């Protein structure tokens, strides 16, 4: 998203419900995993890069 939107998401809301995830690395509000804080695209990229301690290709 835009820089202003990213900062306004980082800003303290005056209401409890006005908060959303807003993935840290890129700023994409859709499809954000709360376990990692990374969106699906960045999750895939870092999982393939081996930079997340424990994630790996799933096969069964």
């Amino acid at each position: 998203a835009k820089k202003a939107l990213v900062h306004k998401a980082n800003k303290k809301p005056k209401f409890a419900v006005r908060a959303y995830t807003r993935c840290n690395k890129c700023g994409r509000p859709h499809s954000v995993y709360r376990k990692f804080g990374l969106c699906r695209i960045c999750l895939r990229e870092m999982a393939h890069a081996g930079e997340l301690p424990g994630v790996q290709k799933s096969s069964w």
Partner: peptide, 18 residues
């Protein structure tokens, strides 16, 4: 697919550990 990510548990190792 990424060859490094293909063998993350067979040949290559992780990048960050904790």
């Amino acid at each position: 697919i990424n060859p490094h990510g293909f063998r993350l548990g067979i040949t290559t190792e992780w990048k960050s550990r904790w």
